């Protein structure tokens, strides 16, 4: 008289916190609760009331034949740090599994537009051993943190949490037994560019702009020597930035500004020497005090395509 239909599992995910982004590894940490509910065969409980079984005691019930399927985080890195866990067994057959978890999760993250980047933090959940003929997800609900003021937070959550329930078919695996039910949660976020605009981009602009002042010096010697102090100032600034900003395998927006600075100061050095060593006149072409910042900003504009 068995029931061979798939077991419908309802899932709720409570996300406490997302943090600890690691840019090079493209990972992030998630702390929260996972709640899974399904209906089994009815049972007798003490006093015909719901029965609570915590932590180690859960293992005793699995040994007695209680079915408690393992649900794997597909995109977790290593074994997640599972805290308290609990089962609730109802007389009518309901079974609810609840667990606190902390894990590091991976996803495709693109930081090229840093510090103005947007990211999709994703949770992917799937049964470890049971295909969708035995265990299928029926619904997914996600509850996040109530935010007071976002100006203090590194990331700003734009929009409600998106969810999906799909099927994953594996070729490497009877017919119709190679398909697993998967839940996908997505939290869209946008970085807080404030800190990076005032402490990094703005001071770097004043530096590059300040380097354009070499054209206002009234001597070749003064123009060429001060340029070297400017160059030294961009290099000293590249260290300050690299020491704080995240490591990546590609350049960001700030990295390109720094390169633009190197190019500006190097270009000015070639112009200072050409003007002075092409003729014997020089001071008049050095009156490019306006032409240089425009050419930089001009190129600076076509870089934004």
């Amino acid at each position: 008289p068995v029931d061979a239909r798939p077991v419908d599992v309802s899932v709720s995910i409570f996300i406490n916190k997302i943090y600890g982004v690691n840019t090079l590894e493209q990972t992030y940490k998630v702390d929260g609760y996972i709640v899974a509910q399904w209906t089994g065969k009815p049972r007798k409980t003490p006093g015909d009331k719901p029965l609570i079984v915590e932590n180690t005691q859960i293992e005793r019930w699995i040994n007695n034949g209680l079915w408690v399927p393992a649900l794997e985080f597909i995109n977790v890195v290593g074994s997640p740090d599972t805290g308290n866990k609990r089962l609730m067994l109802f007389p009518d057959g309901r079974v609810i599994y609840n667990a606190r978890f902390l894990g590091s999760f991976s996803n495709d993250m693109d930081f090229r537009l840093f510090p103005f980047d947007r990211q999709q933090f994703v949770l992917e959940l799937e049964p470890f051993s049971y295909n969708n003929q035995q265990l299928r997800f029926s619904d997914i609900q996600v509850y996040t943190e109530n935010i007071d003021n976002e100006e203090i937070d590194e990331w700003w959550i734009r929009g409600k949490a998106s969810t999906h329930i799909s099927d994953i078919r594996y070729d490497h695996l009877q017919p119709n037994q190679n398909e697993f039910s998967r839940i996908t949660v997505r939290i869209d976020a946008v970085r807080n560019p404030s800190y990076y605009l005032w402490s990094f981009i703005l001071p770097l602009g004043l530096i590059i702009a300040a380097s354009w002042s070499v054209f206002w010096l009234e001597s070749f010697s003064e123009r060429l020597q001060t340029s070297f102090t400017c160059m030294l100032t961009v290099v000293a600034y590249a260290f300050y930035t690299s020491n704080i900003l995240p490591r990546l395998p590609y350049t960001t927006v700030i990295d390109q500004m720094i390169i633009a600075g190197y190019g500006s100061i190097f270009a000015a050095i070639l112009l200072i020497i050409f003007a002075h060593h092409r003729q014997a006149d020089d001071l008049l072409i050095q009156r490019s005090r306006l032409a240089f910042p425009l050419g930089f900003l001009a190129i600076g504009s076509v870089l934004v395509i």
Partner: nanobody, 122 residues
Framework: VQLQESGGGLVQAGGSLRLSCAAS????????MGWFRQAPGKEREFVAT????????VYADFVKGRFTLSRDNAKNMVYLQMNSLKPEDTAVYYC?????????????????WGQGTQVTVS
């Protein structure tokens, strides 16, 4: 990148079709292509695309093992073998290319859509 769908047409309930999407332009591979559909009045919804790990494929919940995604990286094409059709499947089946992000199931992460192929089940 330019995509062009093909293979649509009319069929009765329980029939079969084989859609084809030809990619022309700068594409790193066919892994980035995914099938979507949009019936009149309904949103454009995900159908299928390759999985992250080799040998895996992501299918919408309504597929129920009926459709099967395949690819010819040489010819730079992906195929969708649709079987056991039903009236509910009538829609315009587009072909998108994942433009980034980590939600293969999200149309917002796709682009370069094609003109679409119409499929109708009676």
């Amino acid at each position: 990148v330019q995509l062009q769908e093909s293979g649509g047409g009319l069929v009765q309930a329980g029939g079969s079709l084989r859609l084809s999407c030809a990619a022309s332009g700068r594409i790193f591979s066919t892994n980035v292509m995914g099938w979507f559909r949009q019936a009149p009045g309904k949103e454009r919804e995900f159908v299928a695309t390759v999985g992250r790990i080799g040998g895996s494929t992501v299918y919408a919940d309504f597929v129920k093992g009926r459709f099967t995604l395949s690819r010819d990286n040489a010819k730079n094409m992906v195929y969708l073998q649709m079987n056991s059709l039903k009236p509910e499947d009538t829609a315009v089946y587009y072909c998108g290319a994942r433009i980034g992000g980590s939600d293969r199931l999200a149309p917002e992460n796709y682009g370069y859509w094609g003109q679409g192929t119409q499929v109708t089940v009676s």
